[PDB]
Symmetry: C4
Subunit: 335 residues, 4 copies
């Protein structure tokens, strides 16, 4: 037999970290890090954080308050001075040929940051590494709203720099929820307004998939699984807990997941295990599902799924007008 | 609180751009850019544009008229003459050992351009970067039509050069719709005829997915969602708007999306929000869906989906002949 | 307007090609090309062809007869002798430290060739570049049949050398069908028997997807689309054409697609356009579909799909024994 | 005709192999191999095996007993001493600046090993190379259980080192089942307890997909395919064989696949070919299927699928309470 010993955690350790540099250097740092060979010199996350600081004045100080270092680790240490340097708070080169950003560079930074912040609001980098045509559509919509629709296709100067590492890094920080809350509740001047319009659409019910799946089930299910007593008693509790949270949080209710609010857990599957089981079962059949703590069984869900419920009748006859419209498409009536 | 400031657009900026070189140099430029190490010297989009100019005589001048530069940016600037050179209008080498294209090189250029132009007509590079077995099938069909079926498999000399960047770049230009219109309406000599036969098949109803989804729904839906009054009133309007557009555009009607015609917006979901909602709902159930401006609700769609409509009866008895055919496959009759 | 001119094919051209070397050198060539740095020196397809020649004695001469060159193009020409050398018929190094293959190297070559030949039989490299867990399962089954099940996991010495280019290249050659026919009809000694057992399973009805989809539809469809007259008349013709082909080809009938037999076209969608349309429609609904030349419409298919057919009744009562078995799983009877 | 000869296996051969080094060097070896440039010096599997030895005290000796070499092959041989060295049992550098692991390095090793061991229990690397968001969720759950939830996102120091090769290598060794059995039955101290909690969840019914698919079918199927006599007789045998195995193996029953127990074959499709065919058919329709040795036909499965069975009735009236709850969601009663 193995003895049952296991590797134990040590205490502390310095690991490499990204940084944000100095506030006075944001623009010069951002311009320098538009170049891949410059990005290669630093921790991969650093340029994404610098770009965010450029995008949103005031964010640099917020990051500093959250404990984000000014210094970024270097990709390779340098022995410049008999001393070994592993990090620096400046990212632009000795060759300080300061230029300004171009319009297309700005749109490209917006593209990078749009993907980055979508990942932060949804709490995952998996889609940005992959499920990305929907992200491009959001960016195109933003660029159209800013009267620059061509940039939806052409603002590709950072296309090779995927923000996935920075999504993960931000998602692991204790202040991520506060960061999201600030983005969602700040009234930004254009073009920030248009930028955040897209982030707000994505953030709505983000990380509240149990809640939205149950809501879909309660609206759309046409079978008797809804009537299984342990499910039904949880339906009443779910609607009441939801109502209490809606009253308490008002316009922030759809953002509870995105802001990592502790109340979001009140709408997790463990809170309504039988109802979540039934809704997940329905959802997978319409497109295991049995949750920890549920007493309902798959065999019961199967049997009740075969029985129909009613959501009211609406008339056994079409109006003459609707009958005529139906004739246009080859429909003769109700069956 | 963040102050609500946001990064502002600057005005202007020179960014790197591809180019098309000079008309007299198209073939020499194309031959040179068949080599990956030569392509590495220039903006990634340049060779795709040069190949298009080789494919279609007359296109170079059209591109020039649209504002496409002759000069391509270089991958790396050169300090040749105390002056810094960042771009050039010639892509072939000092070593000017001019050869002609081989048959297989021509088919390979056709392959590259086939993928490129499919992306341009559909308005997306996502499938060419990925969903590509269907594209190979179109290319194989072209090569068979040109009595060179083996080239469908073997014309792979540009297989490592994916046109995705050039798709995006072209899709961002103001003349893209005119470019597509010219391809679709020009009577090309062989082998252009056969090439464009494939592009025309792909372009038919490209970027008109709302229109085709609604048409599918109106033809195939067998439930009462069609009869929901707000849906039904939009069905009549949709069929009439469609008829007006068909009259106005005739043989170009299926190409309105591909040519980026402003009338295409008359068939977008915002134009028929309730009908689009019902058709999208049906479409996802057969394979949210509620559109901005729609009053129909998912719960209503669910309830009506459970009620059948009729599209006419056809007889309660099979013919003796059809009954006998049904016996061949183990079918005893209607149920 | 564009003038309607298009790029014309040239005649001839020498392009790079793979080669098979000399028969006496097969084993030494194969051993040398097990090393990636050696493979990098030659056309990418060459090692796959050499490995096939090693796998199957006699194949080298067959390839020579089919016009396959002994010489492979080099990745880079060499100016060795004031003359420029672009190709060679020997692939092993001056350092001629001849060793024999190991058991694990042999299994690794079998792995590479298994993937390669699956691609050749199915006529596509798309799955080998991707849909590959099913291929590994076939290889594991082979290795188990050869009393070397561990090699199903460990024979990975060629894992970085994907055969996709060689699949495409072979699939473009005029002799591919004859090559497949020879593999399927030769009685190989072990371990060839076990190897080809897997290839034969994959080859069965490969590239006969229209035929197998229609057969599935005729066996499994439970709706009245089968009874639409234009569909039904084609069902009778399809079953009779199929019967004629089965009589003519006997045990080779399932291989008509794999061997690129001209009779395979008699079972293509163009041969039975209404039936193929109905079967494809059914198939997509159970998991456009309207074929060129079909008169049946999607709206008709939709309407008939809603009507049930019968395939006979079997009794309204379960046997006492079957009733008792049903009680074991919570089933009370027929409904 | 080809002669029917085929490549024959040779006997023996030395191939490259990974190694585990010496027990006294585990930690120093692990620290060294946290660096990619050091990993590049050795067989790809070596660091994964070293990390496992670090994770679980006692495992090194178990591996030695199973025949795992101490020496790892080098990526490149060295001619250090007029002798050619191809392998070594030490992986840390001459520059022996011994440091301890950081907390984040430990969590990163846990991440790597979590993915590795999931692959070993399920018997496949395909998901770890790809289907990986579910794996990250398990790791996040572990890190939360260890009061280090941020590490679920941030412990990415080995993110570029995918364990797929080590999964395959371990899966090919004769002792893999014993290895899994030891992991599943050892009572580990924290943080091993929490680590193995996740592995145990994944291992439950791993590689017993036929068993779990049949169980799902027997619980959830609502059609008469269950009553086809050859299917039904196998249902009774399946439930009895399952009961015998449950009695014999008790708490290890769900792990029979994971531990590569010979009894797992008693629940393979060949053991119940008609039942497996029916369950697979149902499963694919709810989300060929006909198994070798089955007499049931797809056409029979199709016909019986259209007939409903009953699993008992539960009342034709809702309770007043359940009726009122149904009113909250727009449901008026049973239909």
């Amino acid at each position: 037999k193995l003895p049952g010993k296991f590797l134990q955690y040590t205490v502390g350790g310095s690991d490499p970290h990204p940084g944000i540099g100095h506030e006075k250097d944001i623009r010069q740092n951002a311009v320098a890090l538009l170049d891949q060979s410059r990005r290669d010199m630093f921790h991969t996350v650093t340029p994404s954080l610098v770009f965010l600081c450029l995008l949103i004045p005031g964010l640099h100080a917020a990051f500093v308050h959250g404990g984000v270092p000014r210094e970024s680790y270097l990709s390779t240490p340098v022995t410049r001075g008999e001393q070994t340097v592993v990090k620096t708070a400046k990212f632009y080169g000795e060759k300080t040929t300061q230029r300004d950003l171009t319009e297309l560079e700005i749109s490209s930074i917006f593209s990078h940051c749009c993907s980055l912040l979508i990942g932060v609001v949804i709490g995952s980098s998996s889609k940005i590494k992959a499920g990305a045509e929907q992200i491009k559509k959001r960016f195109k919509t933003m660029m159209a709203a800013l009267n620059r629709p061509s940039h939806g296709e052409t603002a590709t100067l950072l296309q090779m720099f995927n923000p996935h590492e920075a999504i993960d890094w931000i998602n692991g920080q204790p202040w991520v929820g506060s960061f999201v809350l600030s983005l969602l509740t700040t009234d930004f001047e254009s073009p920030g307004k248009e930028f955040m319009d897209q982030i707000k659409l994505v953030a709505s019910y983000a990380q509240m998939t149990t809640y939205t799946t149950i809501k879909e089930y309660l609206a759309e299910c046409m079978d008797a699984t809804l009537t299984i007593p342990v499910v039904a008693y949880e339906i009443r509790d779910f609607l009441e807990v939801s109502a209490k949270l809606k009253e308490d949080h008002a316009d922030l209710f759809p953002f509870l997941g995105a802001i990592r609010h502790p109340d979001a857990i009140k709408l997790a599957p463990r809170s309504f295990p039988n109802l979540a089981s039934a809704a997940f079962y329905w959802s997978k059949k319409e497109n295991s599902t049995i949750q920890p703590g549920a007493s309902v069984k798959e065999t019961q869900l199967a049997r009740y799924r075969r029985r129909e419920i009613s959501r009211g009748e609406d008339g056994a006859e079409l109006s003459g007008e609707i009958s005529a419209i139906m004739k246009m498409i080859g429909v003769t009536g109700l069956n």
